[PDB]
RNA sequence: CCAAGUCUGGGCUAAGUGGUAAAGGAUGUGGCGCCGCGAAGACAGCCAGGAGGUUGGCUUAGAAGCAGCCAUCCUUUAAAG
């Protein structure tokens, strides 16, 4: 039942680790081993872990795909924000490429539908700085 | 009702100093304003700044307007003592007449400058008016 | 809408809950009656800029209300109005609104603002024949632009009992452009 | 304390009566409002 | 105290105001108009989720309502903050 926000490919540090899982009724050894299993293979970058125990005093559950917000910076060629958003508007793009990229983002989307699609598109756009014209 | 030497003898011609007119922004109905009712010799200074101040807090559209303005002004120490006393000028302003079309807060729905202005009765010094105009400010 | 009296009795009147106000018309006047509590409501309304009229004995019910008046006094509450009616086919001094929307251009992206030293409109179209409510916004805002009579544009009735250039509604620095 | 000037702190501290007296109150050291 | 109605009528005071004062405050109190509703059975008590794309831009070393400069939109649905 804890939340912690553990490195990649360092599974033995003392200070964060320690205090923060030991006095929940965890091991501190055997959690850490588990994770130079999964962690490995993307190695570098700080994944974000769930842990929830039981009645046993064990167990690792859920960890992690990646980013999903650099991907979408190689396509475009806008880094970060241009400046304060309805202020600065620079960056318009089109109808017909905003059409395709909510079609893959459907799982974590609001409804399967074609017209709520489009719709939260819309709401992350102008509140960073990519107008549609 | 004492009043200055002449418009051009003692100290009449100037730009009395002070920092212009216009503020905020538009709008064709909504009312959005202040006035008075207090009688006097509208400190200048005091005056240019308060009004200013008013532009502190807020920054764009609010009438920001204000129709105010002094224009002559009092005199006192200089010289021998207390007798035949010369004049040393000082502190130029307007007569408030006992009220009237102060500076207006006009605009659509902006209370965000009402406030404002609001925060511009607060200062001033006479008391001060809060009010709306033609239809009242929406 | 109602308003009565006409003798001769201002003071009282100008007093308590009836406002004095002349019936005045084209050729004919007539002691000042109304009161002091419908001026509210309809002029609340939008008093020479709509129009309506009172039954006083059924006698005439025609249009033209105000064209004149004052909640003078200080403290702004008016007091001995004006009023004239028309049912004539001649209806010109007429002054009715026009409202624009918002549209986004030194707003809502640059922040840059407009005065509008117009809104109104006194023109003269077709007497007995006016939209209470007019709306024309062309759009355009931002840096040192400006809009005034001229260019305008006028829909049906042709008056304009106005002139070309001059404030229309432009758009300033609300700090800078 | 600012015995002149009072006026309502936290989204709560309230404004109650002793001795005709308008004393600031609310679930805050930060507000012992009094006059 | 000192001469003369502890007159009658109907309001308003709960501070001794009267018996000196301003800016400035506050469901004091009494009398007048407005917006929403109580059988889409209404504000304040109580049961519950206390919704998701919201975890957007400067600064990020931290905005991601709960540092602050700009946004202020979309939603599958019991509605939206």
Redesign the interface.
């Known amino acids: 039942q804890i939340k912690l926000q553990l490195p990649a490919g360092k599974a033995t540090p003392a200070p964060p680790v320690g205090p923060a899982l030991g006095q929940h009724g965890v091991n501190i050894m055997e959690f850490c081993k588990r994770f130079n299993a999964e962690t490995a293979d993307k190695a570098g970058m700080i994944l974000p872990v769930v842990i929830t125990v039981y009645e046993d005093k064990s167990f690792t559950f859920i960890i992690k795909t990646p980013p999903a917000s650099f991907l979408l910076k190689k396509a475009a060629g806008i880094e970060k924000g241009s400046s304060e958003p309805?202020?600065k508007?620079v960056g318009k793009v089109t109808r017909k490429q905003i059409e395709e990229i909510a079609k893959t983002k459907m799982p974590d989307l609001n409804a399967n539908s074609l017209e709520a699609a489009m719709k939260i598109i819309e709401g992350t756009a102008k509140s960073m700085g990519i107008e549609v014209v | 009702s004492i009043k200055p030497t002449r418009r051009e003898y003692i100290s009449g011609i100037p730009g009395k100093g002070i920092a212009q007119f216009k503020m905020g922004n538009n709008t064709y109905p909504a009312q959005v304003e202040n006035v008075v009712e207090k009688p006097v010799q509208i400190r200048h200074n005091a005056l240019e700044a308060a009004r200013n101040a008013a532009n502190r807090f807020v920054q764009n559209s609010g009438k920001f307007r204000i129709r105010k303005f002094p224009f002559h002004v009092i005199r006192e120490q200089d010289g021998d003592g207390m007798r035949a006393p010369f004049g040393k000028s000082v502190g130029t302003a307007a007569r408030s007449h006992g009220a009237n079309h102060d500076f207006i807060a006009w605009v659509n729905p902006d209370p965000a400058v009402e406030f404002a202005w609001r925060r511009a009765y607060m200062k001033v010094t006479p008391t001060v008016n809060i009010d709306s105009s033609p239809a009242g400010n929406a | 809408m109602e308003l009565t009296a006409k003798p001769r009795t201002p003071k009282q009147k100008l007093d308590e809950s009836m406002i004095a106000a002349v019936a005045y018309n084209k050729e004919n006047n007539v002691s000042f009656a109304l009161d002091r509590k419908a001026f509210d409501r309809a002029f609340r309304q939008q008093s020479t800029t709509g129009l309506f009229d009172i039954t006083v004995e059924g006698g005439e019910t025609f249009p033209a209300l105000v064209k004149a008046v004052q909640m003078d006094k200080r403290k702004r509450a008016p007091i001995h109005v004006d009023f004239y009616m028309v049912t004539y086919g001649e209806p010109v001094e007429v002054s009715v609104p026009v409202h624009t929307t918002g549209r986004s251009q030194g707003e809502?992206?640059g922040?840059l603002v407009d005065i509008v030293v117009h809104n109104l409109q006194i023109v003269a179209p077709g007497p007995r024949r006016i939209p209470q409510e007019l709306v024309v916004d062309v759009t355009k805002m931002n840096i040192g632009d400006h809009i005034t009579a001229g260019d305008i544009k006028l829909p049906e009735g042709c008056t304009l009992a106005a002139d070309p250039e001059l404030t229309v509604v432009s758009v300033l620095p609300p700090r800078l452009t | 304390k600012v015995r002149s000037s009072v006026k309502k702190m936290c989204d709560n501290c309230k404004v109650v009566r002793r001795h005709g007296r308008v004393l600031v109150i609310c679930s805050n050291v930060k507000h012992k409002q009094r006059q």
């Open positions: 309805k202020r508007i | 809502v992206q922040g």
